[PDB]
Design a protein around this nucleic acid. Structure first.
Length: 236
RNA sequence: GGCAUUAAGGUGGGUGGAAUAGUAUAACAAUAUGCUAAAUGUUGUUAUAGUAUCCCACCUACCCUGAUGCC
């Protein structure tokens, strides 16, 4: 239907509030996933809530203490004739609200190019199947819109710019890999590859920096629908 | 065969610099709940800071290749 807001628990607490008290426990963790546990006290009942940042913590705390407090807005008696326990009858289930979507078929080109389409006496294994794999990605199919190579066509490397950061600051939502060399310590030719939005790029060089500058340059221009050698003053 | 000097490239480590990210602290205003009043909440603007992510430069060590000289 739509989103929700804490203003409910906030207003409601503000109403019931006879003069309550908020506490802040924990508050420790990494620099980007800190945990705060705020505990809220009314009439001697305290309820603790664990959220990132103080907002959600105090919120959940307020909710709990609200629901408890509405049953003890005042007191004059107590007992011990009650308690609580645990269970394990929930380690399994019999219902859901979602479904799988994984692959179930796949194929590979039977030859260096597409097979005939006007004959029936030049083979015996290209008209009696439609797939042979569903658990791998080793095939090398095509789309008649780009060469069948595992890589896009060649591109010119940079000569003073550095596309690794531009890309890693316009769309850092990628991953990179590094690939083999071709010498002992001289005439070396290392390479890097990348995967970006699902596409794949690669680039070689005399060192790891130059190789990433070519693989990145390729990834940037293609995925950003832009280029790197057609301007030089877009900013200053 | 060993030794000296000179030069090119690559790799590891250390140091320094920059950008991005989330959180936190502090100030100001507005908006909301009550408006008897108090208090609190929500949002906006501004300033500051440990860290994490990533890059760049410098320094050092190592590896390797070229050139020349001596024995």
């Amino acid at each position: 239907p739509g989103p929700v807001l804490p203003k409910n628990a906030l207003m409601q607490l503000n109403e019931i509030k006879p003069g309550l008290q908020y506490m802040l426990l924990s508050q420790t963790g990494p620099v980007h996933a800190p945990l705060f546990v705020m505990s809220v006290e009314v009439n001697g009942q305290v309820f603790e809530g664990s959220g990132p940042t103080k907002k959600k913590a105090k919120l959940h705390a307020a909710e709990k203490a609200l629901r408890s407090f509405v049953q003890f807005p005042n007191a004059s008696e107590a007992h011990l004739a009650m308690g609580r326990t645990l269970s394990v009858n929930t380690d399994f289930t019999s219902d859901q609200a979602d479904f799988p979507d994984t692959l179930f078929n796949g194929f590979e080109t039977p030859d260096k190019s597409e097979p005939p389409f006007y004959v029936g006496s030049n083979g015996d294994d290209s008209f009696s199947s439609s797939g042979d794999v569903s658990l791998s990605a080793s095939p090398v199919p095509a789309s008649l819109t780009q060469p069948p190579l595992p890589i896009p066509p060649p591109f010119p490397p940079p000569s003073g710019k550095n596309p690794v950061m531009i890309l890693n600051e316009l769309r850092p939502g990628l991953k990179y890999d590094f690939l083999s060399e071709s010498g002992e310590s001289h005439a070396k030719s290392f390479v890097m590859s990348v995967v970006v939005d699902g596409q794949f790029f690669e680039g070689s060089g005399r060192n790891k920096k130059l190789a990433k500058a070519r693989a990145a340059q390729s990834a940037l221009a293609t995925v950003f629908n832009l280029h790197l050698l057609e301007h030089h003053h877009h900013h200053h």
